[PDB]
Design a protein around this ligand. Structure first.
Ligand SMILES: *[C@@H]1O[C@H](CO)[C@@H](O)[C@H](O)[C@H]1NC(C)=O
Ligand SMILES: [Sm+3]
Length: 432
């Protein structure tokens, strides 16, 4: 697609800290951009819609190439359309925003300039941020994560994309998403199947896969840390059911691991660690600092700060594993105790090190789950299992509270606030 300017595009500014091993942090001035799928797509020379509701124009978009020639992405009114604001080092994302159309959530990338995403090399480094999850009920996910996307949004590899990172193109993740309207500088209208339960979305014939590090998938009830390796580390198109992921009939049928090696303290038995109110170690009614270190072995270390008090990730015992670090022994014990083999089939933490030794883009999002209702995060899952099945209980949420029609109606003014992003060598993000 190309870009149009019926609505000017002004990326909300967002500051963050780059820290040094020399004992100081320096403020960086970035900005955020909304993902292209959220945008109005229209004809290059008129206001006629290329996509509206959950279907495409037959005359502008008869096929993937013709559509990309005929259509453009427009600018975004961040606050009034999407419920997105920034305030210094803080980013707020709202849940439901009703304007002329219903908007649900947002996915945003951190930029380095007007036309390039910021790329971070995680391996040997640490990432710290603060989060307020207090206004996230069961069924929602305020997510902060990294993907192996191209810095330029794909423009150099697919030059029929002239909108680029300035308009939030180029997304990929370990779910190999097929709901994207543009992949690799072409539309995704071929094979488009409107969602039966979502008047605004559908599934196309192609998807967009890459490595993903879920630093933070969370609400006020549960939180999880999850690396997802892929057999091709960076962005790769996939075709139809061959995609796997959330949008295909067989989730385990493609090149990426859609489940990952997750660490959820509740799931591991620590049911008083994280939750609302004073009976939990981390009280999700109040703001929390989350620190994540990418150790050079490939392991991942986590601690938290709340009201000046530091808490390390809690210890887990699972099988022969005992410890508090997400490491090879953990991931092996997890597959043995809880079942599954997609993580190790895709090469585990050794394949994942290929992603973290390269550049990844920071993504911040808020979403509800039209496929699995976020039960994997905060409830009993899979839903054919029972509470006695090892690993099935991930939070205290009911089965039905995460249905989008319920959460969107009951909690439209849910929101997440991310702030105070700090990045640098291990041990540096506490620097002044
Ligand atoms: C949960 O973690 C906290 C922080 O480490 C600890 O004090 C508490 O004992 C843990 N509970 C369980 C069941 O492991
Ligand atoms: Sm360690």
């Amino acid at each position: 697609q190309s870009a149009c300017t019926l609505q000017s595009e002004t990326h909300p500014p967002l500051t963050w800290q780059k820290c040094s091993s020399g004992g100081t942090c320096t403020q960086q001035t970035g900005s955020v951009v909304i993902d292209a799928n959220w945008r109005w797509t229209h004809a290059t020379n008129s206001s006629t819609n290329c996509y509206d509701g959950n279907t495409w124009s037959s005359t502008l978009c008869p096929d993937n190439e013709t559509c990309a020639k005929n259509c453009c992405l427009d600018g975004a009114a961040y606050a009034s359309t999407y419920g997105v604001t920034t305030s210094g080092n803080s980013l707020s994302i709202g849940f439901v925003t009703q304007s002329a159309q219903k908007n649900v959530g947002a996915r945003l990338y951190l930029m380095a300039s007007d036309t390039t995403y910021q790329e971070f090399t995680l391996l040997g480094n640490e990432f710290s941020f603060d989060v307020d999850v207090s206004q996230l009920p069961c069924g929602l996910n305020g997510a902060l994560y990294f993907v192996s996307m191209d810095a330029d949004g794909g423009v150099s590899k697919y030059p029929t994309n002239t909108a680029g990172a300035k308009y939030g193109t180029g997304y990929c993740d370990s779910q190999c998403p097929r709901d994207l309207k543009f992949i690799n500088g072409q539309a995704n209208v071929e094979g488009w199947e409107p969602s039966s339960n979502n008047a605004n979305t559908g599934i196309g014939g192609h998807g967009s896969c890459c490595s993903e590090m879920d630093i933070w998938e969370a609400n006020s009830i549960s939180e999880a840390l999850t690396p997802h390796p892929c057999t091709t580390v960076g962005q790769e198109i996939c075709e139809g059911d061959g995609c796997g992921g959330t949008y295909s009939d067989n989730r385990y049928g493609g090149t990426c691991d859609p489940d990952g090696c997750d660490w959820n303290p509740y799931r591991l038995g620590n049911t008083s660690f994280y939750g609302p109110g004073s009976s939990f170690t981390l009280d999700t009614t109040k703001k929390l600092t989350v620190v994540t270190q990418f150790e050079t072995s490939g392991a991942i270390n986590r601690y938290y700060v709340q009201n000046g008090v530091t808490f390390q990730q809690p210890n887990a015992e699972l099988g022969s594993y005992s410890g508090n670090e997400l490491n090879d022994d953990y991931c092996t014990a997890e597959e043995a105790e809880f079942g599954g083999s997609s993580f190790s089939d895709k090469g585990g933490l050794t394949q994942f090190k290929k992603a973290t030794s390269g550049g990844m883009v920071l993504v911040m999002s808020l979403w509800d789950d039209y496929y699995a209702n976020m039960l994997w995060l905060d409830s009993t899952y899979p839903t054919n299992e029972t509470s006695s099945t090892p690993g099935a209980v991930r939070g205290s949420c009911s089965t039905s509270s995460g249905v989008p029609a319920q959460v969107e109606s009951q909690s439209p003014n849910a929101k997440v606030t991310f702030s105070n992003i700090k990045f640098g060598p291990i041990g540096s993000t506490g620097n002044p």
